[PDB]
Amino acid sequence: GVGSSSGNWHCDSTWLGDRVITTSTRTWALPTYNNHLYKQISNGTATNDNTYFGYSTPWGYFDFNRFHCHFSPRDWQRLINNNWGFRPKRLSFKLFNIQVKEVTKTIANNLTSTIQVFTDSEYQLPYVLGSAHQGCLPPFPADVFMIPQYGYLTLNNGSQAVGRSSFYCLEYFPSQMLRTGNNFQFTYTFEDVPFHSSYAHSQSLDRLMNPLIDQYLYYLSRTQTNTQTLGFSQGGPNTMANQAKNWLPGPCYRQQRVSTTTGQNNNSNFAWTAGTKYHLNGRNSLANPGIAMATHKDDEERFFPSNGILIFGKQNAARDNADYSDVMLTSEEEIKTTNPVATEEYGIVADNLQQQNTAPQIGTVNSQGALPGMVWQNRDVYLQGPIWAKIPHTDGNFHPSPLMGGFGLKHPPPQILIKNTPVPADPPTTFNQSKLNSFITQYSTGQVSVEIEWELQKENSKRWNPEIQYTSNYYKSTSVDFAVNTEGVYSEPRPIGTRYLTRNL
Amino acid sequence: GVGSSSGNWHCDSTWLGDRVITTSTRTWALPTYNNHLYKQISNGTATNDNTYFGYSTPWGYFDFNRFHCHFSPRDWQRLINNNWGFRPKRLSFKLFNIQVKEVTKTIANNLTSTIQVFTDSEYQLPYVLGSAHQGCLPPFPADVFMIPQYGYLTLNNGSQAVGRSSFYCLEYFPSQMLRTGNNFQFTYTFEDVPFHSSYAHSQSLDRLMNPLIDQYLYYLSRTQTNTQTLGFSQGGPNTMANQAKNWLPGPCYRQQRVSTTTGQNNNSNFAWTAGTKYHLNGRNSLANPGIAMATHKDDEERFFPSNGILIFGKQNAARDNADYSDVMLTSEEEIKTTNPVATEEYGIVADNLQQQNTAPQIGTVNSQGALPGMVWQNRDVYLQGPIWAKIPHTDGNFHPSPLMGGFGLKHPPPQILIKNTPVPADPPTTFNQSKLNSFITQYSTGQVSVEIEWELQKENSKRWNPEIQYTSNYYKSTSVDFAVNTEGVYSEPRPIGTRYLTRNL
Amino acid sequence: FHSSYAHSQSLDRLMNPLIDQYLYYLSRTQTNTQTLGFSQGGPNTMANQAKNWLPGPCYRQQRVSTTTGQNNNSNFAWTAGTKYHLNGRNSLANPGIAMATHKDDEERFFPSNGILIFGKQNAARDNADYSDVMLTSEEEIKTTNPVATEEYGIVADNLQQQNTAPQIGTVNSQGALPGMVWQNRDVYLQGPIWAKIPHTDGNFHP
Amino acid sequence: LFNIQVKEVTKTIANNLTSTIQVFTDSEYQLPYVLGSAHQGCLPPFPADVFMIPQYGYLTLNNGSQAVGRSSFYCLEYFPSQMLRTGNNFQFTYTFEDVP
């Protein structure tokens, strides 16, 4: 009905046992995108690394692939201070209280106008969620947000398409059409995904041994008396670097080190030239943030990999060339215990065969793929960070955990595509075969509810001393952190990670 | 209800066994035609060949008599690369989400206004579908189309009607009246129609014999030793043109040959004067495209019958005098194996009785009606081409397959007539017997869904070598074929036929 | 199931081309004096965008042109061949791991021992000419697998300071990394169907 | 088909008892139908007459002496065939359609 609400506001979080159910409602506004048209979009030689061919669609899409879309900062604190892990279990999504409005400036209700909503439940469309794009549900529930426009990329050769390039018409899908009295809803069940490691290791991989007992294994301790010899010693509490060990640190893809103290950096523009990159079809792309490696080693917080960390912008940070004070650098220092430092070499290997005439030579391993016995931690998730990514449908993957963090899903939450149904203006009174291009200017607004049930891994720890916990600062300040200022602007002052509790290795 | 949708968007194709169910939804706009009037329309001596008498009606009509209204190009590829034949089985049609809008310029909803919809299920109206008219559902689902105005022709003598001329009032039919909350739907079952031959013959009609064995039948091989004689030879692998055969090529109605290389054409305007025509009631009409004949013989792709092929226009092709580069010529070369070439003679017959004093004379058969033992193929259907035509209700027909291709139906899908119900403006406060001519300016828009179930004839072939398949070009291009360009214009770059798989004769 | 398909998307082009990322990347280190400028990855800086996945592993092969004049005038099929070493024995990594045969517009190039080569009918057993053999191409996996004759990527080789300019290392061999995805080699009508996985303690993607 | 004898010729002719013939009917009409072209090789009119079986060949689309892309090649070994040794027989039944 026109005069009856099609749904209620549901913003809440219920903690019950090993589950937390976050539900969040937001008010959205969907404009008409592209003037109801599908437009081919391209970029040519811009450098070759940035070329693309794709399509802009008249459809919007709903994104809730950030943790702050579901967790309030206090709820995030509850989660990270008390749980060793968490994972999504199921979600329910609702669209309701839809209002389609005609603008001629006067804005009027168009009671008979529709919106079209469908979920790509078969994953037949290019999945553009999981690319850390803007347009997600705002962290602050009172915030009204604009629905982002759906577009996708296909195969390109410069600015040109190839024969394998795919064009998708989203009208070629079954869509529910909704008038102002209608509502849309669907439920989704997450696949069995591993718990995110919401903990930092309280032991280092090279310090898993008893510090009081010698090893019964020997290591080559000396090769020279001086003349050649072979001296063997037992690894013990003092020669702990020489001890036989069962495991290796995770893989390494070395990144350039950048200091937040700019005077310590090289006086050159090396963000791209020295950037750590991968090469794909003659195109260079940053390995950003790349594989999960420790941001820095001990007492080197000022250093970060050049493109090896998630960088969030503070409120009102510039899109381009934001200063360091306008951005929020994350740090994966919690995984120092298992993952190699992002800006350091993995290790040292022999580069030759030493003889009595040739001294042994060593090679510095700046990139190390998977080795047996290697263990590693994934990148941390953040309150502002992504939740899930679609695992690409390929023959093979290795540890398909998304590199910007979160849960890798073969069948992620489906894309929810929404569009204002075009309403033609008055057509001519004589028939014209040409497609109509005169449309009533129109936009829709409504409420969107997303409810996610998360399973929790409770910490079962015998640690005696108190743990590190995320806490708000006790000292006075002009404004409350994670609140609005005097102008009503909600801001997130820092990126809250997830690893505060500790586990043994 | 005003605020509730009366139907959902259903664009899809489901392939299940020997069936494919295409469903397509489009947004339409229906203006007020003729100012709600029936107008007599005529054309006099214009030449006598183009005279007509008929009526323009205030009604629109829904047309989905083109294959691209139902098949996406990829679906068409699936159909033609894998099936020897197909035919429609049933259809369901839906009108829903109707919005009637008042324009005064401001456009407002007229919630209490109606549209009138009825199907000519008894075929009591002149059937104007199956004349390859514009106004069908657009090939691209995102495209909003204008509903064509319904008009018809009756008997004429020049610009005058005769006593047998029929006038039809479409208001004299029962129509469903629909407000914004109403929807219209009907189902239709296709009669048992033959499968369209979605194949080309891999054998020629004159090459059906074993190429290793002689015939036991003899043919007159020589009449002269020189003196008269009678020499008879057995048809064999080398005298294959002389062999006794069981079948004849299909009928011929010879068309003038035109070269796409214009320099090879006669320097004259002969499109009409040399056009292949039929004569009906003193009126000349092109036999266009005429009976199904092969467009050209081997290695003569540049040649086409002057009015013997379907010619589709490229996107934005001019209505009049479009250049050859702006049109898409079809080719029926696949039926060379059974049908005579459209621009060649059917064969040679004797024109006299040879004697010792009169040499035998031969006549060139440029028009050949049905002969016993004759076999032929119908014209191919195209993605852009028509699907069905109504077989005229006559005492006799011969092979009632529509000449522009498709399925001949005695009871085709009924015409769906739609009209905005006239809404008078304020009448005078004193009675006037005259019909009201002051109407509220009004148009309607809505969604139309047509679902057609097609039965498939699966290819059961023992051919060893790979078949010819319709494929997109692998090489790079500025735009994807059968996609939108940078301006949002959907285009069909070529006419996709249907005959790619092969069968023996 | 064997992947009887080619990807219509590239691994580095999985993002929405209309929306900026909310993540920032280090966009400039120099104003000139040192500085730290950060930009949001968007439709134009698509190479800089944060991404979830990496191309499959690489074991770089030497590039050979079917246009022989573009090749080095030497006999390098074995000397420059991409090989593995086992018990003091050198064997070609032939055809090696599944990598794209060539990048865009480089069909004439193939890895020296990185593709399946079938012989045409009556091709000589030894020293068959290029016209007597049928080169396969794994160009369909360009979207996910690195090109067989190109480097996997670039890594840092040192620690840059105000006195030492940053140095980069070219990764010509890259083992499995987390987040890496790849396609297997295509099968062919003339090609093998199955192989026995060797009975070993460990294998990676057998 | 019955009383099949497969004979080896080396001139001496000997029985090859273990040799087979392959027989199949194109019951689905998937092969080019070369019967009905008034060819020689039919069963002789006189029952006492011993006849040679004609060789099967077929024609496909041609452009002069060249094939076209639509030309079909058929391998008759690509059909299920009954293999018959000297002790085996082959038989099938067929029903004519309603013909005038």
As given in the structure block, the two tokens for residue A334 are 């919690």
Interface contact C170, partner A, CB < 8 A: no
- Token readout for C77 is 């099929």
Residue B165 C-alpha from the chain's centroid: 27
- The data reach a resolution, in angstroms, of 2.3
D99 residue type, one letter? V
**Chains touching C (3+ CB pairs < 8 Å):** A
C-alpha distance from B407 to closest chain D C-alpha (Å): 26
Kindly list the distances between the CA atom of residue B336 and the CA atoms of A106, B300, B467, D61, in Å, as whole numbers in the listed order. 65, 12, 18, 10
Residue A314 structure tokens: 């503070």
Chain B residues touching residue A423 (CB < 8 angstroms) = 99, 101, 445
Structure-token match 């749980």, residue found: A83
| B217 touches B267 (CB < 8 A) | no
d(CA C11, CA C100): 13
Please report, for residues A412, B349, C79, the alpha-carbon distance to residue A169 in angstroms, rounded to integers and kept in the order given: 21, 57, 52
Is the distance from CB of C21 to CB of C40 less than 8 angstroms? yes
Cβ of C142 and A281 within 8 Å? Answer: yes
Which residues 385-424 of A are in CB contact (within 8 Å) with C? 389, 391-392, 394-404, 408
- Give Cα A194 distance to the centre of its chain: 16
Which of A:98-127 have CB within 8 Å of C? 126-127
Residue closest to B303 by CA, chosen among B261, B358, B361: B261
Cis before residue B289, ω within 30 degrees of 0?
yes
Distant-in-sequence, close-in-space partners of B245: CB < 8 Å, separation ≥ 6:
B205, B206, B208, B209, D37
Q: Is B35 left (phi over 0), alpha (psi -120 to 50) or beta?
A: left
Which pairs from D63-69 meet CB under 8 Å and 24+ separation? D63/B298, D63/B299, D69/B468
Give the closest of B211, B217, B462 to D59, CB-based: B211
Residue C64 CB-density burial (10 A; 0-12 exposed, 13-18 middle, 19+ buried): buried
A259 marked ligand binding residue: no
DSSP B80: H
Inter-chain CB pairs, A–C, below 8 Å = 378
Nearest CA-CA partner of C104 in A157, B474, A284: A157
CB contact under 8 A, A274 and C26: no
Per the CB < 8 A criterion, the answer to whether B62 and B120 are in contact is: no
Give the closest-approach CA distance of C124 to chain A in angstroms.
34
User: What would the two tokens of residue C27 be?
Assistant: 């966009």
Q: What is the DSSP string of A454-472?
A: EEEEE------SPPP----
- Check if the beta carbon of residue A326 is closer than 8 Å to that of residue A313: yes
A112, A102 in Cβ contact below 8 A? Answer: no
Tokens of B172: 């004299």
Q: How many angstroms separate the CA of residue B473 from the nearest CA in chain A? A: 5
Instruction: Tell me how far apart the alpha carbons of residues A317 and A325 are, in angstroms, rounded to a whole number.
Output: 9
Q: How far apart are CA A183 and CA B314, in angstroms?
A: 42
B474 touches chain A (CB under 8 A): yes
Contact C109, C147 (CB under 8 A): no
Provide the 10 A C-beta neighbour count for residue D22: 13
Region of C9 (left: φ > 0; alpha: ψ -120 to 50; beta: rest) is beta
Q: How far is CA D38 from the centre of its chain?
A: 16
DSSP per residue over A284-322, as a string? EEE--S-S--BS--TT-TTEEETTSS-EEEPTT--SSSE
> Quick one: how far is CA A126 from the chain centroid?
18
Which is it for strands A107-109 and A83-103: parallel, antiparallel or unpaired? antiparallel
Q: Do A428 and B144 touch (CB under 8 A)?
A: no
CA dist A46 → A49, A51, A52, A182, A246 (Å): 8, 7, 10, 46, 49
Euclidean distance between CA atoms B425 and B34, whole angstroms: 17
Distance, in Å, from the CA atom of C61 to the CA atom of A295, rounded to the nearest integer, reads 33
Distance to chain B for D94, nearest Cα, Å: 21
Amino acid at A103: V
Residue B463 is nearest to which of D42, D63, D72, comparing CB atoms? D72
Q: Which of A4, A184, A431, A432 is the best mutation test for B, with the most CBs of B within 10 A? A: A431
Backbone angles phi, psi at A76, to 5 degrees: -60, -40
Question: Does B202 contact chain D (CB < 8 Å)?
Answer: yes
Chains D and C touch (3+ CB pairs under 8 A): no
Query: Is A290 labeled as ligand-binding?
Result: no
Residue A297 CB-half CA count within 13 A: 7
- Phi, psi at B312, each rounded to 5°: -100, 145
Distance from CA of A129 to the nearest CA of B (A): 23
List the structure tokens of A503.
């586990």
Neighbours of A275 (CB within 10 A): 27
- Provide, as residue numbers in chain A, all residues whose Cβ is less than 8 Å from the Cβ of B473: 163
Residue found under tokens 């001296």: A231
Does any CB of chain A come closer than 8 Å to the CB of residue B468?
no
Q: Write out the two tokens for D72.
A: 């079909």
What span, in angstroms and rounded, lies between the C-alpha atoms of A82 and B504?
75
Separation of alpha carbons B257 and B259, rounded Å: 7
**Separation CA B295–CA B335 (nearest Å):** 9
Output the CA torsion sign for C138, C139, C140, C146: positive
Task: List strand residue ranges (DSSP E) for chain C, in order.
Answer: 23-30, 34-40, 54-55, 58-59, 63-65, 83-86, 89-92, 109-111, 117-119, 133-135, 153-156, 168-171, 173-174, 180-182
Peptide-bond breaks in chain A following residues (C–N over 2.5 A): 45, 104, 225
* Alpha-carbon distance A418 to nearest alpha carbon in chain B (angstroms): 12
CA C123, C127, C131, C135 torsion: positive or negative?
Answer: positive
Across the interface, whether the CB atoms of C17 and A403 are under 8 A apart is answered: no
Closest to B305 in 3D by CA, of B256, B366, B250, B252: B256
Residue from the list B202, B216, B460 with its beta carbon closest to the beta carbon of D72: B202
A165/B103 touch (CB, cutoff 8 Å), yes or no: no
Nearest residue in C to A253, CA atom:
C155
With an 8 Å Cβ cutoff, is B479 touching chain A? yes
Helices (H), B62-192: 73-82
Residue B92 to residues A1, A165, B10, B448, Cα–Cα distance (Å): 28, 33, 12, 11
Residue of A nearest to C142 (CA): A281
What letter does residue B69 receive in the DSSP assignment?
G
Three-state SS string over B400-465 comes to CCCCCCCEEECCCCCCEEEEECCCECCCCCCCCCCCCCCECCEEEEEEEEEEEEEEEEECCCCCCC
Give the sign of the dihedral formed by CA C52, CA C56, CA C59, CA C62.
negative
Chain B residues within 8 A of A421 when measuring between CB atoms = 27, 97, 447
Distance separating alpha carbons of residues A196 and A404, to the nearest angstrom:
13
**B505 CB-near residues (< 8 Å, 6+ apart):** B201, B203, B204, B205, B208, B337, B338, D32, D33
Helix, strand and coil content of chain C, in percent to the nearest 5, comes to 5, 25, 65
Residue of A368, A386, A200, A364 lying closest to A294 (CA atoms): A200
